[PDB]
Amino acid sequence: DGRYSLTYIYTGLSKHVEDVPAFQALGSLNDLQFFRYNSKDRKSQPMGLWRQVEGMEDWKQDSQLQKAREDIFMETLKDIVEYYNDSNGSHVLQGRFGCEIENNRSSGAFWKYYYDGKDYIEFNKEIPAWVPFDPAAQITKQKWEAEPVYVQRAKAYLEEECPATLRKYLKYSKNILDRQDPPSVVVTSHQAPGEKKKLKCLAYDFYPGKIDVHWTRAGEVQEPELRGDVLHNGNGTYQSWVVVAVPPQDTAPYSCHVQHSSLAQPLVVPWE
Numbered sequence: 536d537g538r539y540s541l542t543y544i545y546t547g548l549s550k551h552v553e554d555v556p557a558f559q560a561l562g563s564l565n566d567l568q569f570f571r572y573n574s575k576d577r578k579s580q581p582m583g584l585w586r587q588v589e590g591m592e593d594w595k596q597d598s599q600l601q602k603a604r605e606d607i608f609m610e611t612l613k614d615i616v617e618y619y620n621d622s623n624g625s626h627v628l629q630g631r632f633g634c635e636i637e638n639n640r641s642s643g644a645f646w647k648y649y650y651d652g653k654d655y656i657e658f659n660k661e662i663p664a665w666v667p668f669d670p671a672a673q674i675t676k677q678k679w680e681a682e683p684v685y686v687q688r689a690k691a692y693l694e695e696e697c698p699a700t701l702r703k704y705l706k707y708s709k710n711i712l713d714r715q716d717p718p719s720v721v722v723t724s725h726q727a728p729g730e731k732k733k734l735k736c737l738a739y740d741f742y743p744g745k746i747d748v749h750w751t752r753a754g755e756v757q758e759p760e761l762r763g764d765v766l767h768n769g770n771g772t773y774q775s776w777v778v779v780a781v782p783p784q785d786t787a788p789y790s791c792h793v794q795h796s797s798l799a800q801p802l803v804v805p806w807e
């Protein structure tokens with residue numbers, strides 16, 4: 536088995552904007568979004584290829600779970616805004632949480648909040664405790680640690696419930712998540728007549744996103760002067776590219792290397 540993750544982004548606004556739900560929720564399996572929810576419709580909706588999967592989750596039931604989470608989340612926002620007494624300005628709270636498994640063993644988890652884009656509070660499950668980054672998070676910390684069972688429940692969600700949901704979802708999502716699309720490659724060059732040649736290598740049309748694209752000079756990896764990535768959200772493919780500068784007096788042979796999980800071995804594309 537490989538690495539899999541289940542992650543969530545919850546976002547909440549203190550100030551109503553027309554046609555924008557105050558509370559918005561997104562869930563992801565690896566880099567693919569599988570469900571959404573908002574405060575207008577108040578319904579857990581599957582997304583993408585999970586619209587055609589049956590039995591993974593009871594979405595009607597999960598909508599009740601999300602309503603409950605909405606109320607506690609928005610109450611936390613309300614408390615922060617009341618702490619600063621800016622009850623007429625626009626403010627945002629974002630919570631992010633999730634877990635990971637590799638080789639079917641838990642390999643990570645996190646649970647963090649941001650207020651107006653800055654670190655607010657995070658759960659450190661190894662202590663265990665909520666760690667505040669902002670004066671107002673002292674009040675939130677104390678509500679969430681008012682009884683010694685709350686911390687243990689928080690730890691247990693990250694270490695037991697989140698991985699159990701992930702393992703459940705994998706039995707239904709394995710084909711979707713194990714998609715292997717191999718990269719195609721394009722190599723480019725340009726130069727002023729007798730000056731530094733710029734060589735660019737681009738891998739594209741690939742999934743999953745993890746990849747290593749690099750130039751070698753006679754086998755030795757070169758440091759790019761420029762690099763970049765692309766994600767086409769629609770078809771769910773990626774691209775990744777690097778540029779190196781080659782002195783006009785450099786005669787060594789350059790190749791582009793592409794290491795990706797869909798390949799038996801790295802693609803090596805010489806530039807001649």
Ligand SMILES: CN(C)c1cccc2c(S(=O)(=O)NCCCCCCCCCCC(=O)O)cccc12
Pocket residue numbers: 721723737739765774776
């Ligand atoms: C800003 N830079 C680095 C770029 C220039 C041109 C296209 C680029 C694309 S793209 O998605 O539009 N490219 C798709 C190419 C696939 C078809 C192969 C035809 C040859 C492409 C010319 C090489 C190139 O400019 O990358 C994506 C990202 C960066 C691009």
